[PDB]
Amino acid sequence: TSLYKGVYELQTLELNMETLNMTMPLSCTKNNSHHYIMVGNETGLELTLTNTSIINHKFCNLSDAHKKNLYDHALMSIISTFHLSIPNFNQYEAMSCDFNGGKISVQYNLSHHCGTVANGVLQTFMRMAWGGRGNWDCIMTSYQYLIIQNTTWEDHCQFSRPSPIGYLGLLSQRTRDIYISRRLL
Amino acid sequence: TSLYKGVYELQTLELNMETLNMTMPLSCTKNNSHHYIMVGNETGLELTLTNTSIINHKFCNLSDAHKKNLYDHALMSIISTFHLSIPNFNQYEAMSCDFNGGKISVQYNLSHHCGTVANGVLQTFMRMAWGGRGNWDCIMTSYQYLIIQNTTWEDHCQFSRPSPIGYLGLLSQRTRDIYISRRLL
Amino acid sequence: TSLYKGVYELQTLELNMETLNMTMPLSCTKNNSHHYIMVGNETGLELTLTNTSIINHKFCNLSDAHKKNLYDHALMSIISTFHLSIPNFNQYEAMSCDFNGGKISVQYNLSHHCGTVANGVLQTFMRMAWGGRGNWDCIMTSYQYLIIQNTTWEDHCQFSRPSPIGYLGLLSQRTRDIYISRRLL
Amino acid sequence: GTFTWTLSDSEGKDTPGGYCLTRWMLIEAELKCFGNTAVAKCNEKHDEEFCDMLRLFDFNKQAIQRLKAEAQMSIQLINKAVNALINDQLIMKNHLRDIMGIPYCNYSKYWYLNHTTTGRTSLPKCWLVSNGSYLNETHFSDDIEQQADNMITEMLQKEY
Amino acid sequence: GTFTWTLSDSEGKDTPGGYCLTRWMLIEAELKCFGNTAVAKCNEKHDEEFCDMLRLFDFNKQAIQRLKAEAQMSIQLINKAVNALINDQLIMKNHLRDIMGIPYCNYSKYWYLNHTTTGRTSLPKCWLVSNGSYLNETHFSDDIEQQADNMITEMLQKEY
Amino acid sequence: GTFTWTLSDSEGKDTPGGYCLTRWMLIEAELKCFGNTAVAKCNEKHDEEFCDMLRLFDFNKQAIQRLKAEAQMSIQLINKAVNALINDQLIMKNHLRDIMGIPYCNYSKYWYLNHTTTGRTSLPKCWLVSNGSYLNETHFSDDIEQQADNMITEMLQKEY
Numbered sequence A, B, C: 001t002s003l004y005k006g007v008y009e010l011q012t013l014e015l016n017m018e019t020l021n022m023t024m025p026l027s028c029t030k031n032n033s034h035h036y037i038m039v040g041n042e043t044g045l046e047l048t049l050t051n052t053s054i055i056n057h058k059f060c061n062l063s064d065a066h067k068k069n070l071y072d073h074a075l076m077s078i079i080s081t082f083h084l085s086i087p088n089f090n091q092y093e094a095m096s097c098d099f100n101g102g103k104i105s106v107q108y109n110l111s112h113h114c115g116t117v118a119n120g121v122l123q124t125f126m127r128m129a130w131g132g133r134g135n136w137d138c139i140m141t142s143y144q145y146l147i148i149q150n151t152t153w154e155d156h157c158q159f160s161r162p163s164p165i166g167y168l169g170l171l172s173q174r175t176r177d178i179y180i181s182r183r184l185l
Numbered sequence D, E, F: 001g002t003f004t005w006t007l008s009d010s011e012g013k014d015t016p017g018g019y020c021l022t023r024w025m026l027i028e029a030e031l032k033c034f035g036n037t038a039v040a041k042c043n044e045k046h047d048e049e050f051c052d053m054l055r056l057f058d059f060n061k062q063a064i065q066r067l068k069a070e071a072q073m074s075i076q077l078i079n080k081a082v083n084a085l086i087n088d089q090l091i092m093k094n095h096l097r098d099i100m101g102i103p104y105c106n107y108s109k110y111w112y113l114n115h116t117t118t119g120r121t122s123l124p125k126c127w128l129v130s131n132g133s134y135l136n137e138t139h140f141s142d143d144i145e146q147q148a149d150n151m152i153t154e155m156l157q158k159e160y
């Protein structure tokens, strides 16, 4: 097929990353709009770019979630890494959360010229999923909202192979581009 | 004694780490339950695993301590590194602090299956001291409490040689495994 | 001129760092007391060591600045890096801020023996500017105050060549020497 | 800092010190063994992606055999060891190449030059993906002959 | 981790693979071309300052030609890539040398030994500044002969 | 990034460029001098523990002689320079080996192969501790002959 020089051959590898389901979360997507992160073989999360909002309240009850430790620690760490890698995040009105019962729900409002929270939030989306008219490090999408939410595990990511690299890379940049909101911190 | 090949000899080194007392804090322990960190030749800290609590209030008056800068900066930085390396710390009820007069007192409640603050707190203990039935990256001890407190300097760590490596390694992982408690941060 | 061995010559380079004005902020100073940081070819900041205070209120309205996103993101990130690299910062009374209209104003009170916020603040000053009787890693200056403030771009730094290395190095140490002010964080 | 993890001994008769990938690891390709040279190549290199992946594989294998799965995830190990297993900014470099519009690493397919007669391999490197598709083998043929020349030179130098 | 950025191809006929600095880059010194050896020297070195600077230069050039300036700064790229372009603690080492009172790197002037006949160069290294002034060439003459010996040894070894 | 600190000149006649440990440094063993080769070995290595320790020793010596003790600690220097003196994830690797249950580095005892006739030394490496005790010299004898072979090969190659 692909023979180079006289004997070297372009044999390729397709690493089955499901073998890392027991230690690392894997990212894969279905139709370029439904991205997914699966941790273990029992739980995962939806990442849906859509015009429909499941949440109509501007709250994120994080300290209430930590008070009642009834959630999965892996998922909360995943979303913590996701939220600490958002470049120059400064508008807290956009983010909305739901954690009742241990469910993981996070909605983002991508409403807007550039220098918008939508820019950085899409940036960290493609930092994580690696699946995807904007220029000069500014990206715009017709989708008004994005939803992250808890789900069971299936094989519903035909479009993309599962990979952990998105989360491992996102761990690097957490708290890197954060703004100061208090002097003492 | 230990001769290899024909001329090479297994001569060994026992580095006197007290020579680094003027720049680096040194960790050494006495009876596998009293661990110590000595900074300089004048001040150090107790690390005692015990069933007795010296503190009966669930406070940590950190901003009050910073307001009245009457403490030793080295000790506060030591405990700051210790508290920022606790993996996935999420229950703030456990930690208790006392700083009146510049004294450094920190107590930890190791009450509990796994996924408990005791697991991560023992993890960072053996990250620091390097002196020590739990499995699968979960560790349990019969000791209910642990105490860190100010003390003078003596030679009371027969069990373990003093070494700085615990603190230098702990500096690496600070803020690495932290949970998000606010959107803006 | 400077000939070594028989043919090697000490030819020197003077890198014109203005060619990096479009991606990196450049640091240069005028009279050893007026330091500057220029980002782009349109905006920069004053760093003046002086006995005169432009600000007489002990506030830093950071969350108000993030609410009304009318400022330049580059300048806010610059000052964020500057404030997260201040070693062992513990006295918040000193720092004062003004952000009305997008203007960047930060004043520091260098009032005081050592172990003072002035020590670390001068340390990070010479971390950034690299332009400059104190001993044993303690530095004192007769100047009571320092001012950072917005300005346009000119060539007013005869004393020092513009360089980006101060900010790139300051990015390394951000959040490294920070004190814990809350258990959860 | 840099990575410090070392590869666990692999139960491959042909390759004593080199990580050998089993049937489960490689999709629909049974078992292949790489050798000690290819895996040990990046004990100084910070610009290779596949050997970081096999370090992740070996860390997972160690964590499974020598701890207990317990059916619930322990993210603690991976969050602590991620900087000790893989390079931290190689993913940044590939993200930047992706943003700019040059072909970037997929991190799923890796290509290598299997020496047919002897069975040696270069350390596999990422198959570039661009424009929403894999690059044609013609496009990076030059890189292929680059690696071929590298392999020949390294082998000849080490043999002497 | 460490730096992972690679130098973009430079349009210099004499130096195909080595970053060549144009007129704008060098103050009042027109254009000079370095070569592939000098620029590739620090693909393993973490203790050189000038090649980190030329990596910054090449990153800026890529960001300008292949994106749009838009007249407003994008600090995102530099904040993401700073660890992928330059070493993170070399600046720390020079800050420490400065605090202690030994001559530290300026990061503005760099000196190198231009071979007059052939035009090769050592990788330029920082001209030490102390006491508020540049060190006299007599003071670090020993370092100059150090680099001269290094260049001769490296060249002779590579040629053979 | 990686470490960038360089070893200060040591007042040892036998070893001009190699860090020599004085009486105070070594418990009950007077003074030993290592040499330039052993100390300079890890200017590229990130997997050695003892030379990081002697870099800590040299940093302490510099901080004492060229600053003032003042009788109160300055943690600023060590917190700034820790990444410039030692590797940041080697301690992580030894912590992981400890958790898994394989012998881990103590960081107190280090063993080396002193050449009796000539006085050369390998760079000392950590004496493995396990199960709450030091490993018997029989257990890691294989590693000892590994280092012996390494020393012989390196010496013969460098001499030629």
Ligand SMILES: O=C(O)[C@H]1O[C@@H](O[C@@H]2[C@@H](O)[C@@H](O[C@@H]3[C@@H](O)[C@H](O[C@@H]4[C@@H](O)[C@@H](O[C@@H]5[C@@H](O)[C@H](O[C@@H]6[C@@H](O)[C@@H](O[C@@H]7[C@@H](O)[C@H](O[C@@H]8[C@@H](O)[C@@H](O[C@@H]9[C@@H](O)[C@H](O[C@@H]%10[C@@H](O)[C@@H](O[C@@H]%11[C@@H](O)[C@H](O[C@@H]%12[C@@H](O)[C@@H](O)OC[C@H]%12O)O[C@H](C(=O)O)[C@H]%11O)OC[C@H]%10O)O[C@H](C(=O)O)[C@H]9O)OC[C@H]8O)O[C@H](C(=O)O)[C@H]7O)OC[C@H]6O)O[C@H](C(=O)O)[C@H]5O)OC[C@H]4O)O[C@H](C(=O)O)[C@H]3O)OC[C@H]2O)[C@H](O)[C@@H](O[C@H]2OC[C@@H](O)[C@H](O)[C@H]2O)[C@@H]1O
Pocket (backbone or CB within 6 Å): A060, A061, A062, A063, A064, A065, A092, A181, A182, A183, A184, A185, B059, B060, B061, B062, B063, B064, B065, B092, B181, B182, B183, B184, B185, C060, C061, C062, C063, C064, C065, C092, C182, C183, C184, C185
């Ligand atoms: O998120 C986010 O991010 C965002 O959000 C948004 O919204 C919101 C939401 O979110 C929600 O929230 C909620 C909440 O509520 C919650 O919380 C909580 C949590 O956290 C938790 O907690 C816990 C607890 O509980 C426990 O216990 C405790 C104990 O511990 C103790 O403690 C203590 C303490 O208390 C203390 O403290 C303090 C200190 O710190 C200090 O302070 C100081 C001061 O003094 C100063 O001064 C200040 C100033 O600053 C000022 O301010 C200002 C203002 O005013 C302004 O405004 C203005 C107006 O007025 C007009 O004029 O218009 C204009 C404008 O501008 O602004 C500015 C700015 O911008 O910034 C500012 O500045 O005045 C005031 C004063 O105060 O300052 C300083 C500094 O800066 O630094 C400071 O420092 O001293 C005092 C004291 O008090 O401390 C102590 C010591 O000593 O240490 C301690 O002891 O006791 C208490 C208890 O409790 O603990 C724990 C631990 O530890 O950890 C904790 O954790 O849990 C509970 C809860 O409650 O959370 C939740 C969740 O998450 O889930 C949530 O839901 O809702 C609400 C809303 O709002 C917001 O908005 C934001 O914020 C922002 O904006 C606003 C403003 O105001 C602020 O500031 C900012 O931040 C956010 O961000």
Ligand SMILES: *[C@@H]1O[C@H](CO)[C@@H](O[C@@H]2O[C@H](CO)[C@@H](O)[C@H](O)[C@H]2NC(C)=O)[C@H](O)[C@H]1NC(C)=O
Pocket (backbone or CB within 6 Å): A018, A019, A020, A021, A022, A041
């Ligand atoms: C997650 O990965 C693990 C290990 O790679 C899979 O576990 C194996 O599953 C097969 C399925 O029949 C069993 O025969 C093996 O005994 C399992 N091995 C171990 C070590 O558990 C698991 O199947 C994967 N999850 C899913 C949903 O496929």
Ligand SMILES: *[C@@H]1O[C@H](CO)[C@@H](O[C@@H]2O[C@H](CO)[C@@H](O)[C@H](O)[C@H]2NC(C)=O)[C@H](O)[C@H]1NC(C)=O
Pocket (backbone or CB within 6 Å): A053, A055, A056, A057, A109, A110, A111, A112
């Ligand atoms: C998402 O953001 C958009 C725009 O910021 C919000 O739409 C605004 O809603 C308010 C409240 O009804 C109106 O007064 C504005 O005129 C709307 N602006 C636009 C441009 O539509 C929208 O409400 C946000 N989503 C949610 C769930 O609150």
Ligand SMILES: *[C@@H]1O[C@H](CO)[C@@H](O[C@@H]2O[C@H](CO)[C@@H](O)[C@H](O)[C@H]2NC(C)=O)[C@H](O)[C@H]1NC(C)=O
Pocket (backbone or CB within 6 Å): A059, A060, A061, A064, A097, A098, A099, A100
């Ligand atoms: C997050 O916390 C807020 C705190 O106010 C919750 O808002 C309260 O919700 C209860 C629920 O019945 C109401 O009775 C209160 O009146 C609400 N507070 C106010 C000020 O109106 C909010 O519900 C929490 N988030 C979720 C998802 O429950």
Ligand SMILES: *[C@@H]1O[C@H](CO)[C@@H](O[C@@H]2O[C@H](CO)[C@@H](O)[C@H](O)[C@H]2NC(C)=O)[C@H](O)[C@H]1NC(C)=O
Pocket (backbone or CB within 6 Å): B018, B019, B020, B021, B022, B041, F024, F064
């Ligand atoms: C801490 O270490 C320092 C230096 O390693 C020790 O200082 C020496 O102490 C001896 C004791 O007699 C003196 O003779 C030396 O003059 C001291 N040298 C210096 C540079 O100070 C100190 O003793 C150690 N602390 C303790 C408690 O032993």
Ligand SMILES: *[C@@H]1O[C@H](CO)[C@@H](O[C@@H]2O[C@H](CO)[C@@H](O)[C@H](O)[C@H]2NC(C)=O)[C@H](O)[C@H]1NC(C)=O
Pocket (backbone or CB within 6 Å): B053, B055, B056, B057, B109, B110, B111, B112
């Ligand atoms: C340390 O934690 C234990 C358990 O979480 C605490 O013991 C509880 O104390 C409360 C208050 O009296 C009782 O209502 C519970 O029944 C106790 N539970 C158990 C399991 O003992 C203990 O009080 C904590 N220590 C301190 C100092 O508060």
Ligand SMILES: *[C@@H]1O[C@H](CO)[C@@H](O[C@@H]2O[C@H](CO)[C@@H](O)[C@H](O)[C@H]2NC(C)=O)[C@H](O)[C@H]1NC(C)=O
Pocket (backbone or CB within 6 Å): B059, B060, B061, B064, B097, B098, B099, B100
């Ligand atoms: C930490 O701060 C809290 C703030 O409430 C202190 O609690 C107060 O202590 C004073 C001391 O006399 C009492 O008069 C107050 O009534 C207490 N507050 C409340 C709400 O009851 C606490 O004492 C501080 N910690 C320490 C160790 O002093």
Ligand SMILES: *[C@@H]1O[C@H](CO)[C@@H](O[C@@H]2O[C@H](CO)[C@@H](O)[C@H](O)[C@H]2NC(C)=O)[C@H](O)[C@H]1NC(C)=O
Pocket (backbone or CB within 6 Å): C018, C019, C020, C021, C022, C041, E024, E064
């Ligand atoms: C900032 O740097 C840029 C690029 O190094 C300079 O842009 C050039 O400016 C000259 C001035 O006449 C023009 O001829 C070029 O066409 C410009 N090139 C580009 C790519 O923009 C700019 O001048 C510098 N800023 C200032 C204030 O001098």
Ligand SMILES: *[C@@H]1O[C@H](CO)[C@@H](O[C@@H]2O[C@H](CO)[C@@H](O)[C@H](O)[C@H]2NC(C)=O)[C@H](O)[C@H]1NC(C)=O
Pocket (backbone or CB within 6 Å): C053, C055, C056, C057, C109, C110, C111, C112
């Ligand atoms: C900067 O700090 C100095 C000293 O901390 C402040 O001067 C003090 O001001 C208060 C208020 O008038 C007096 O009660 C003190 O006696 C002053 N002390 C000294 C040493 O002068 C000064 O006010 C601060 N600057 C600002 C703008 O508040």
Ligand SMILES: *[C@@H]1O[C@H](CO)[C@@H](O[C@@H]2O[C@H](CO)[C@@H](O)[C@H](O)[C@H]2NC(C)=O)[C@H](O)[C@H]1NC(C)=O
Pocket (backbone or CB within 6 Å): C059, C060, C061, C064, C097, C098, C099, C100
């Ligand atoms: C930062 O926030 C504080 C919040 O109190 C502002 O202080 C208020 O300023 C307004 C302005 O007219 C006054 O009406 C209020 O009375 C002030 N608050 C108090 C408690 O007195 C402060 O002005 C803000 N900073 C700036 C520069 O505006």
Ligand SMILES: *[C@@H]1O[C@H](CO)[C@@H](O)[C@H](O)[C@H]1NC(C)=O
Pocket (backbone or CB within 6 Å): A041, A042, D069, D071
């Ligand atoms: C997940 O994997 C474990 C380990 O093989 C297995 O015991 C468990 O049944 C799996 N989960 C499901 C839902 O099959």
Ligand SMILES: *[C@@H]1O[C@H](CO)[C@@H](O)[C@H](O)[C@H]1NC(C)=O
Pocket (backbone or CB within 6 Å): A051, A142, A143, A144
């Ligand atoms: C979401 O809204 C946008 C603009 O309102 C428009 O493209 C369309 O209605 C939705 N987007 C898509 C992709 O359907």
Ligand SMILES: *[C@@H]1O[C@H](CO)[C@@H](O)[C@H](O)[C@H]1NC(C)=O
Pocket (backbone or CB within 6 Å): A129, A130, A131, A158, A159, A160, A161, A163, D106, D107, D108, D109, D129
């Ligand atoms: C790698 O290529 C495969 C080809 O099918 C694709 O499914 C996958 O999404 C690609 N990887 C990424 C991260 O996009």
Ligand SMILES: *[C@@H]1O[C@H](CO)[C@@H](O)[C@H](O)[C@H]1NC(C)=O
Pocket (backbone or CB within 6 Å): B041, B042, F069, F071
């Ligand atoms: C600590 O060491 C210093 C420096 O040698 C010395 O002056 C001081 O007396 C020592 N402290 C005590 C309590 O001996």
Ligand SMILES: *[C@@H]1O[C@H](CO)[C@@H](O)[C@H](O)[C@H]1NC(C)=O
Pocket (backbone or CB within 6 Å): B051, B142, B143, B144
């Ligand atoms: C602390 O309590 C535990 C359980 O209550 C028990 O082992 C003992 O009373 C104490 N532990 C030790 C080591 O004495």
Ligand SMILES: *[C@@H]1O[C@H](CO)[C@@H](O)[C@H](O)[C@H]1NC(C)=O
Pocket (backbone or CB within 6 Å): B129, B130, B131, B132, B158, B159, B160, B161, B163, F106, F107, F108, F109, F129
């Ligand atoms: C190293 O071995 C000695 C032997 O006595 C022991 O005291 C010390 O605790 C060991 N080091 C650590 C970190 O446990």
